[PDB]
Design a protein around this ligand. Structure first.
Ligand SMILES: [Zn+2]
Ligand SMILES: [Zn+2]
Ligand SMILES: [Zn+2]
Ligand SMILES: [Zn+2]
Ligand SMILES: [Zn+2]
Ligand SMILES: [Zn+2]
Lengths: 129, 129
């Protein structure tokens, strides 16, 4: 409620804030540890759960490292597109020099000004089977 | 009205029907001529106007040949994507072997089943400036 529900949203805001400052993918462990170093007192279970909400509402992007651990980043600022899981919303960052190249030339081919494009991929994720 | 508005929709239906049977891009002239050969009595102005409505509501796709003439086809049945004019809705067919290739591998890369994708391009057309 007021001791709990206001302290809850205050935790999330602290997680959100740490992300805005990080430029690279980080595990939930690494993110918990840096919050701790920064004076926060936020349990690892709460961190993992928050990053999951973020990773499936499209605020953070995710990857699975050769370990098995999920890593996270606030959406990347440099132009890219996303792969998304239909079932849980898990968002993965995707791109390509030579796809983005195709999309540009084909517009100026037919003589179009003010070009823009949307590329989206979807599927049922590994976890979701 | 009943002599006019019912005969009007009857004309469009005859144009729509000819398209369902043609597999290749054809000018408004060529399409008028074949309607005529098929027993219809539909003026060239009405044909040109119908194909324009179709070309910008997304029923036919369009191209501009080295002459300057617009050519038209009912949407192609083989998998492709579209370029579209923001201003008039002019729909042009676009595709690529090596774009479609990228989209598939990147999904089965991260271990996704039941893959699908949407690619859309947009811009202000040559006619529209
Ligand atoms: Zn992203
Ligand atoms: Zn792009
Ligand atoms: Zn999933
Ligand atoms: Zn088409
Ligand atoms: Zn495709
Ligand atoms: Zn236009």
């Amino acid at each position: 409620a007021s001791a709990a529900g206001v302290r809850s949203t205050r935790q999330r805001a602290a997680i959100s804030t740490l992300l805005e400052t990080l430029d690279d993918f980080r595990s939930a462990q690494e993110l918990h540890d840096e919050l701790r170093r920064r004076g926060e007192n936020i349990g690892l279970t709460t961190v993992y759960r928050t990053l999951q909400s973020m990773a499936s509402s499209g605020l953070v992007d995710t990857l699975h490292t050769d370990t098995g651990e999920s890593v996270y980043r606030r959406c990347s600022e440099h132009h890219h597109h996303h792969l998304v899981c239909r079932s849980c919303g898990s968002t993965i960052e995707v791109g390509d020099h030579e796809v983005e190249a195709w999309a540009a030339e084909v517009a100026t081919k037919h003589g179009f000004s003010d070009v823009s494009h949307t590329i989206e991929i979807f599927g049922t994720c590994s976890d979701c089977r």
